[PDB]
C-alpha cells in the first residue's frame, strides 16, 4: 500500500499551486481545472490550494468506497468566508455550519418536516399553485407580444419563481413575486442571495486573515449580502410567530413547514430561525439555474422534448388530473432531471473529511484528510458515461444496473445529502409538467453555453428562449 506522498500532485507549495491555478485557468473556471488535472495525473490526485489540501477522485468505484467508510456525523468542506461571517458577526448557525451531535439534532428535526414522505405530500398543491402562476405569466407575455410567441431571457423570472416556491412551502403564504408589480424588498432578498454566492469566490482558498487584507472590498460586499439575508429572514420568522398568536387557531389544513416546526418539534425557536434562514437562501439560485439548464437541453434536443411532453400528457390522463398520482407516472421526466444535473451540476464537488485511514487505488489516505469527488469532471468523463455530451434521460432507466452505480450525485449522498432535495425535486418536476403541457421551447441562433463557477456553477452567459403555446 503506497504512502500518501506518492499520490500524483503539482507539488507541496499551496501558494505556488494557487498562483498557477489563477494564472492558467482562473477562479471562475475551477471545474475546468479539475478536468485538466485528471487528464494530467490520472483518476486520483492531491492538490494543496493555499491552506487547504485535498485528495481528488473521479471513479464511481472510489466514490463508493469513500461513502461506505462514512461515519455517523459526516463533515464536508466549510466555506471560510461563510464561517468567518457567522463567527465574527455572531449569527446563529443552522444545519449547514454545525457538526457532530449538534448537527444531528437539527437534521433529525428538519428531516421530519422537509424530507419525509408524510410531510412532503403536503408540498404538492403549494408548489403546483406557484408553477400554474408561472405558466400564466408566460401566456400573458405571449398575448402582449402579439406574435403568438414570446422570446426572452427568463433568468430573473426563474429566481422569482424559486423564491415564491420556497416561501410558499415554508410560510404557507404567497409573496406575490409572480404578479406584474413586485415587492421590492423581496427582490432585494433575491439579489442578496446571488451576491452572497458571487462575492464568495475571490475569498476561496484563503484563510480569513488574508480576506480582509487582500479582498477587503469583496469581504465588505459579502458581509452586506449576508446582512440582508439575515435581516429579512428574521423579519419573516418574527412576523409569522406573532401572527400565529394573533390568529390563535388550531388548523386541520396544512399551513407549511414553519407552522409544523413551531407547533411541534424538539427545536428551540433560535435553531428554527437559523434553519429557516438557510432553507430560504438555499431555495433560490439552485432550482432556478437547474430548470434553466433543463429548458436549454430541451431546446437543444427537440426529440427528447417531444418524448417528455408525450409522457406528461399520458400521465395527466392516466392520473385523471391528480398531481400526486402523476408524479409516479413520469419516470422519463425524473430521469431527465438526473441527466440535467449530470451535465450541469450545481456543486463542482462533494467532499468528506475521513474519520479513519482509507485505501483508494492502492494509496493510503490518512484520517482527517479532505477527499473531494469531482462531480463536474465525472459527468463529462467518457469512461464513466457513454457519449457524455449527449443529453439522454433513458441512460438512467437502463436495466444494466452498473451504468448508474454511484452516478446520481447532484444532491450528494447519505445522512448529510441535500436537505432541500425533496423540495427541489418536487418543485422542478411539477414546474416541468406545467411547462411541457403548455409550451414548446426553442432557442433561436442556438449556440453552446459554457459554465462559470460563482460558488455554485452557472451558465456563463444569458440564454434567450422562445416559447410557443402548445
Amino acid at each position: 500500500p503506497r504512502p500518501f506522498n506518492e499520490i500524483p500532485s503539482p507539488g507541496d507549495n499551496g501558494w505556488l499551486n494557487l498562483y498557477h491555478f489563477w494564472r492558467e485557468t482562473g477562479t471562475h473556471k475551477v471545474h475546468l481545472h479539475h478536468v485538466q488535472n485528471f487528464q494530467k495525473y490520472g483518476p486520483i490526485y492531491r492538490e494543496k490550494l493555499g491552506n487547504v489540501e485535498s485528495v481528488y477522485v473521479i471513479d464511481p468505484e472510489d466514490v463508493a468506497l469513500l461513502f461506505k467508510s462514512e461515519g455517523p456525523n459526516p463533515e464536508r468542506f466549510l466555506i471560510p468566508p461563510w464561517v468567518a461571517y457567522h463567527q465574527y458577526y455572531q449569527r446563529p448557525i443552522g444545519v449547514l455550519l454545525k457538526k457532530s451531535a449538534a448537527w444531528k439534532k437539527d437534521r433529525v428535526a428538519l428531516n421530519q418536516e422537509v424530507m419525509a414522505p408524510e410531510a412532503t405530500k403536503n408540498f404538492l398543491p403549494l408548489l403546483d399553485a406557484v408553477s400554474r402562476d408561472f405558466v400564466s405569466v408566460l401566456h400573458r407575455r405571449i398575448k402582449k407580444a402579439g406574435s403568438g410567441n414570446y422570446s426572452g431571457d427568463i433568468s430573473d423570472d426563474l429566481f422569482r419563481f424559486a423564491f415564491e416556491s420556497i416561501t410558499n412551502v415554508i410560510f404557507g403564504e404567497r409573496q406575490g413575486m409572480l404578479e406584474e408589480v413586485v415587492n421590492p424588498e423581496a427582490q432585494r432578498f433575491i439579489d442578496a442571495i446571488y451576491q452572497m454566492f458571487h462575492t464568495s469566490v475571490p475569498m476561496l482558498n484563503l484563510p480569513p486573515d488574508l480576506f480582509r487584507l487582500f479582498r477587503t472590498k469583496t469581504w465588505k460586499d459579502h458581509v452586506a449580502a449576508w446582512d440582508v439575508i439575515f435581516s429579512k429572514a428574521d423579519i419573516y420568522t418574527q412576523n409569522f410567530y406573532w401572527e400565529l398568536r394573533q390568529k390563535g387557531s388550531v388548523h386541520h389544513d396544512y399551513r407549511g413547514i414553519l407552522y409544523r416546526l413551531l407547533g411541534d418539534s424538539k427545536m428551540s425557536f433560535e435553531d428554527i430561525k437559523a434553519n429557516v434562514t438557510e432553507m430560504l437562501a438555499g431555495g433560490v439560485d439552485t432550482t432556478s439555474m437547474t430548470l434553466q439548464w433543463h429548458l436549454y437541453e430541451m431546446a437543444r434536443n427537440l426529440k427528447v422534448q417531444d418524448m417528455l411532453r408525450a409522457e406528461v400528457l399520458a400521465a395527466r390522463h392516466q392520473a385523471q388530473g391528480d398531481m400526486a398520482t402523476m408524479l409516479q407516472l413520469v419516470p422519463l421526466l425524473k430521469a431527465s432531471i438526473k441527466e440535467t444535473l449530470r451535465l450541469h451540476p450545481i456543486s463542482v464537488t462533494l467532499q468528506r473529511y475521513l474519520v479513519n485511514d482509507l485505501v483508494l487505488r492502492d494509496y493510503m489516505i490518512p484520517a482527517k484528510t479532505l477527499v473531494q469527488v469531482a462531480i463536474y469532471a465525472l459527468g463529462r468523463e467518457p469512461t464513466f458515461f457513454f457519449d457524455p455530451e449527449n443529453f439522454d434521460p433513458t441512460r438512467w432507466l437502463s436495466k444494466d444496473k452498473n451504468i448508474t452505480y454511484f452516478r446520481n450525485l447532484g444532491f450528494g449522498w447519505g445522512v448529510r445529502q441535500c436537505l432541500g432535495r425533496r423540495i427541489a425535486e418536487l418543485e422542478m418536476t411539477i414546474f416541468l409538467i406545467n411547462m411541457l403541457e403548455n409550451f414548446r421551447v426553442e432557442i433561436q441562433h442556438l449556440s453552446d453555453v459554457g459554465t462559470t463557477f460563482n460558488l455554485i456553477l452557472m451558465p456563463e452567459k444569458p440564454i434567450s428562449f422562445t416559447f410557443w403555446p402548445f
Partner: peptide, 27 residues
C-alpha cells in the same frame, strides 16, 4: 437507520426509493 425513517439515507437496507437503492429499504 441513521436518518430515522424519513427516506433520507440507505442504512436501513435489508422513484425516490429507487434512487436511494442505486447508491428494499427497511423503513
Amino acid at each position: 437507520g441513521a436518518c430515522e425513517g424519513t427516506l433520507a439515507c440507505s442504512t436501513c437496507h435489508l422513484d425516490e426509493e429507487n434512487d436511494m437503492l442505486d447508491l428494499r429499504l427497511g423503513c
